[PDB]
DNA sequence: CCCCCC
């Protein structure tokens, strides 16, 4: 019969030491232990009882195939880029998070900006039909450049539309307005990185009230960690515990995780370990005035380099 | 661990009251402690101490296998898991092997999470095996194991059983992972219906990154703990773990090593290199950086657009 | 019962507790196998041909290496002589400090049966330091409690059965020889000899043995082939 | 920053935090929870709480962007 | 007092 170490349930440090010093080395030893039984023999605290027979007594299996499923029906958030969602498999995937590399001044904004239109996108017309969260830690989300955006997806909405001429297209467009886009769209400014700390702590809650949530970008995970924070140590720790909990809200919430980075001299920043923390990675770069989208790291396509552009119509090819 | 009811038979409520106030909570108390002086000054048998001595021995203590058991049990219980690589096969020896905790280290893009996707295809449908993929920084694509399943057979019932052969289990931070790989141990101890016999953690390093760091030092013993468990998982429930670990370099002699520091570097039994060519983006250079049956430093070339 | 110079003569020159230390891929589960393959080989062969027991703390004991090694040092290799080999050797599975303590106690009642199990592999002690650590405490008594048991349980082992305690050691700290202690001062002071375990850029490997009563320093080169390990 | 004193923090714990030197968001964001759990005692669901309760009063409030098109006009 | 960390 197995037996679980109390080292691993995330009991509290003194309460284990006291647990383990009383002879609880198996959580198995306890379920059966009453929790006034547990204080007065332990000497730990009536609510901190409660609160480790409730962790020990707590401890989903989708097989590939139910996964492989819910990839198909949770569609992935379309780029308006063909090139792009070629090579990322439809666009940005759900339950994934993806790292817009590049120089400053490429169109990773522009990305982001085009991804929050998107996921608003109903989903008879391959979209998601979900909100998106913007967590803008440069100070560059332009609400008129979203604005432009989500006009023109309207546009081309309606274009398609028209062309397949049906009555549900035209419906679920209906509640697809500029002010429902732009009210769909929850920004937050971090103004430091202690702020997105604490905004990326907060979004479980936010996204358990806000159900339809499908993206959310942080526009700039390198500016709050290179500026106002002279640690490599403490920033590494900060920037693998924020991926672990960008992955885990992605997948747990099943939503698309936009992480912004920039360039190091060539190198995306935040150093060679922190290329770990994002599923995807597109390095954004410029050639010969022209834009070039390489896709660095990918799990599931080959990588390779496109074409895209920024035209008034948004992200287009 | 504590003395309890139904512990052990032949014990009872007063003899664990007495041996409470006699300064004796523990089976190591009980059995490090003289059987005789606790016999005479607590007022229970010595002969009923002896014996629930001998049963606590009996039961919480490992017994030892013989060496010629152990072999002929793992000639059979042991499997060389083929990648499905044929180079990453030749440098392993024809493979994985069951049993042992297999590390893939790599920095980003260098290939553990594609290795580790060809091996859990190739085990669901070459093998017809289950697999657990233990995704902790999101890496499994469900359509990356199609798309290696289509490479392998062009049958889409072979390929729709080999995909509902990988179970796929989502783990973030270590106590995630922890649940998780207890709740296998458990599966397992249920079973013993197709069992998992591959456990792909991709990545260890990802969750216990955090951990580290700072003046704590538990996140070495959670990271220790989650090492137990995968060798529990990999020797005593007998299935191939293949964790993926980053790589860093050592601000002393500049030189690569697997991540998440020297108490780490013991916990796989094999470790894979893999690294990317100085002078395509497909190959890589895979190196046998620790191994217990092959020499170190063997240099094979894999090419991930071979399969897929 | 055998001495300590026959067990491997290089090492030796002149109830022992020994102890590897070094990082991985250093040879220290490699030097156990090639004690292991000295002590269980056939008088014929060449071996002490006396049973010894292997404690996995850090479950990395390959069965199919140390096979392989004996095959290769056998003259002639065969699969009974080969299982009659193994016969001699015993493995113990230990997950926890505690349950490593339980086995050496139980351990005891087999040492008393076995009169020719000689010596006393231990691989690795160091595997639960860090768990004991934090659920001990700040308190370094409580942290280190277990394993103290533990070595008191060891000496008391190698003392009456005359055990030569082969411990393997693994190197977690810098210390800002490179060896920085980190048990209990009850295991230290049990340590007759300490050797140290280093591989040269990856064939040759270098050993130090230091020994404690004499604080005397010997070198040793090693290489480690199919065969086993091999002394320069 | 912010000091955990108006946060929200107890006393006691908020002398514990004091011991280590942890007074601002900053300081307490700026650990992994394992550290906090260490520091703080309290479990890693007690201290994902905390670090909730914590962020609520020092992370940026929820502002829509038809928000940000009403103030702009 | 070492732990990890390109
Ligand atoms: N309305 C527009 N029409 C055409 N081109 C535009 C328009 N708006 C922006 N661009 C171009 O698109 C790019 C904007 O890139 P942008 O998305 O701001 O990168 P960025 O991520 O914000 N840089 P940084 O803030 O340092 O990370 C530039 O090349 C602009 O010239
Ligand atoms: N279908 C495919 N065909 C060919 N090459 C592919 C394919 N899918 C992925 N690749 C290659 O695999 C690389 C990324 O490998 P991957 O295994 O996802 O990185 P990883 O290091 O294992 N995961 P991470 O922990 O983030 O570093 C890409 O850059 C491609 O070169
Ligand atoms: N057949 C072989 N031929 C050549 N070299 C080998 C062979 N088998 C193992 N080796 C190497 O010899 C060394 C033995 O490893 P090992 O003895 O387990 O190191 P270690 O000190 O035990 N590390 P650890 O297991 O974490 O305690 C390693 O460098 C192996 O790569």
Known sequence: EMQRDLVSFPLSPAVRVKLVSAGFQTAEELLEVKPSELSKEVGISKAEALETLQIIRREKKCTALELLEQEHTQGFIITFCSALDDILGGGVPLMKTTEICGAPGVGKTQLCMQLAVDVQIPECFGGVAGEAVFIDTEGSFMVDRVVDLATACIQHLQLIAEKHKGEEHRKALEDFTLDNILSHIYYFRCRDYTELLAQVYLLPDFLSEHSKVRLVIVDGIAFPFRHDLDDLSLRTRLLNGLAQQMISLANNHRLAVILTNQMTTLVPALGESWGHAATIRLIFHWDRKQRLATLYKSPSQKECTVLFQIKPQGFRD | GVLRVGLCPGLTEEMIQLLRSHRIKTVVDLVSADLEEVAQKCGLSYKALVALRRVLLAQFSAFPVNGADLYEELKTSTAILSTGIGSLDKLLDAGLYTGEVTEIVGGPGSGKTQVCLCMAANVAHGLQQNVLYVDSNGGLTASRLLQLLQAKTQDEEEQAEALRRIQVVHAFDIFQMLDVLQELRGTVAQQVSGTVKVVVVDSVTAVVSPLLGGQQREGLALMMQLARELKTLARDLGMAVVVTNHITRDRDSGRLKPALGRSWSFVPSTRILLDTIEGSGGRRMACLAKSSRQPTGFQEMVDIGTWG | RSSLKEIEPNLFADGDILEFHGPEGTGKTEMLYHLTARCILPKSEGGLEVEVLFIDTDYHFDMLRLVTILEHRLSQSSEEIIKYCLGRFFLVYCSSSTHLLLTLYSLESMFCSHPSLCLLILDSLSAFYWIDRVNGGESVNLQESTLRKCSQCLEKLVNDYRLVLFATTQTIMQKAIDYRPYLCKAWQQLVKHRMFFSKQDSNQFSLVSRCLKSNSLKKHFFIIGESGVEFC | ?73
């Open chain 4, 1 to 73: 920053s912010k000091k955990l004193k108006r946060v929200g923090l107890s006393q006691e714990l908020c002398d514990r935090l004091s011991r280590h030197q942890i007074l601002t968001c900053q300081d307490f964001l700026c650990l992994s929870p394992l550290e906090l759990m260490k520091v703080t005692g309290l479990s890693y669901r007690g201290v994902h709480e905390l670090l909730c309760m914590v962020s609520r009063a020092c992370a940026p409030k929820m502002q829509t962007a038809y928000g940000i098109k009403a103030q702009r006009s």
